[PDB]
Amino acid sequence: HWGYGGHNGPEHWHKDFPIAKGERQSPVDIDTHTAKYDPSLKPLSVSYDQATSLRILNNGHAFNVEFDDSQDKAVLKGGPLDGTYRLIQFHFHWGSLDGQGSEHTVDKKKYAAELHLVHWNTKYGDFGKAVQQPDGLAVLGIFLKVGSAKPGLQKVVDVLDSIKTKGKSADFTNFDPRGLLPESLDYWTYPGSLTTPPLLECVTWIVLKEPISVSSEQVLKFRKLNFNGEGEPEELMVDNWRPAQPLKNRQIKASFK
Ligand SMILES: CCNC(=O)c1ccc(S(N)(=O)=O)cc1
Ligand SMILES: [Zn+2]
Numbered sequence: 001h002w003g004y005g006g007h008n009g010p011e012h013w014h015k016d017f018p019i020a021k022g023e024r025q026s027p028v029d030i031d032t033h034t035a036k037y038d039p040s041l042k043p044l045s046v047s048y049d050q051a052t053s054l055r056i057l058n059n060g061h062a063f064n065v066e067f068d069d070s071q072d073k074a075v076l077k078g079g080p081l082d083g084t085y086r087l088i089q090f091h092f093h094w095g096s097l098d099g100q101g102s103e104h105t106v107d108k109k110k111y112a113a114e115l116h117l118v119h120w121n122t123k124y125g126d127f128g129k130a131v132q133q134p135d136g137l138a139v140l141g142i143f144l145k146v147g148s149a150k151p152g153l154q155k156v157v158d159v160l161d162s163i164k165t166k167g168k169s170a171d172f173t174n175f176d177p178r179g180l181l182p183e184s185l186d187y188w189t190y191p192g193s194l195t196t197p198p199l200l201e202c203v204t205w206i207v208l209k210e211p212i213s214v215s216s217e218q219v220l221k222f223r224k225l226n227f228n229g230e231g232e233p234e235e236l237m238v239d240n241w242r243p244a245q246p247l248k249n250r251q252i253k254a255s256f257k
Contacts, residue, residue, distance in 0.1 A: 002197045003061065003227060005235065010242045017197045024201045025245035026192030027103035030252055035188055038253040044185045044206065045078035046140070046178075051087060053175040056159055060166035060227055061196060062091040062240055065156065065175060069120070069127070074177070076119045076138050079206055079255065080189045085119035085138040088127055090177060092116070093195070094222045096238035098146045101219075103195050103241045104207050106143075111211055112219055113144035114241070115180060116195075131194070136202040142182065143211035150214045152179020157221040165230040182210035186256035195242045209256065 002008050002016065014020035051074035055066045066089045067074055074087035094113035095101030102111035117140040120130040130136030144150075155175055162170045186209045193201045225237035 004240050005227075013197055013199065017199050019193070019199050019201065022193070022199070022201055023248050024191050024193055024250065025199065026195050026203060026205060027105070027242060027244055028190065028192065028247050028250075028252070029105045029108060029244040030188050030207065032107050035252040035254045037257050038255070041080055041189070041253060041255045042078045044076070044140075044187060044255070046076055046181065046185065048074045048087070048176070048178045050074065051177055053172050053177070055169050056156070056163055056172040057169040058163040058166055058225060058237075060229075062093065062237070063160070063163060063225065064089040064091045065172060065177075072122065076117075076140060076206075079187065080204060080253070081138055082135070084122045086122055087117060087119050087177070090115060090117045090180070092144070092222065093241040094144075094219060094238065095241065096223065096236075098216070098219070100239070101241055102143055103244075104141055104143075104205075105244055111143040112146050113214070113222065115142040115144060115212075116140070117142075117177065117180075131198075131200050131202045133202055134191070135204060137194075138204045138206060141205060141207040142180065143208070144214045144219070145211045146216050146219055147213040148215060149218060150180070150212050152176070153214055153218055157218050160221055160225060164224070165226045165228060165232075167229055180212065182208055182212050184208070184210045186210065186254075188252050188254055190250050190252045192250075
């Protein structure tokens with residue numbers, strides 16, 4: 001199976017998922033000196049007031065906080081998007097040490113982690129149909145740096161002990177994802193892909209410029225998770241990030257001057 005180990009990591013994925021070498025793969029490096037301000041981009045509308053989180057799952061590659069997406073509760077609109085995108089899950093990618101972990105980079109800088117809030121375009125009816133479309137998904141990406149603690153992250157880190165290994169889940173209701181956002185919603189955007197197999201080219205990426213700060217203790221708790229299942233040899237869940245892929249024939253646009 002694919003992973004981020006010594007023998008099944010990102011450089012191997014193309015053998016089962018040839019789109020790994022496609023034309024709109026993610027993540028990418030964001031060159032802040034080449035991305036152009038686009039005055040036609042609108043403010044992002046993040047409407048998370050009615051979000052309903054349900055569960056948190058260790059799926060062997062990350063942990064996903066899952067939401068009820070059976071109605072337009074938590075939605076993303078505006079920005080570069082046409083239409084309404086419903087929040088289905090969020091997860092993170094992170095490193096074995098603070099100097100790596102993000103998927104996107106900014107002028108080659110790697111952040112300690114990156115949060116992905118995954119949304120699907122409701123014009124396609126369900127998530128599985130949305131991932132087959134070039135405008136099916138919108139993923140809001142937020143960098144994490146280590147410094148002050150993020151109060152709104154602590155409920156997530158304190159449940160992690162209960163989902164240490166692959167296939168474990170826990171009830172996770174009433175979690176408010178607004179507590180994971182930075183102050184500013186200035187962003188970069190470009191067309192890309194899922195960053196894990198099947199690597200489908202179905203994503204409008206929206207990457208916030210302002211990182212959130214998390215504490216060393218918070219990220220250390222992500223790094224105590226396991227990729228393996230219960231009872232199997234322990235492999236810490238660290239360095240679950242794909243490195244930057246070729247930009248090819250794409251432009252990265254900035255929402256801000
Ligand atoms: C189809 C099963 N895979 C997913 O639904 C999926 C969602 C988001 C991302 S990411 N890392 O680009 O936000 C990758 C994969
Ligand atoms: Zn992701």
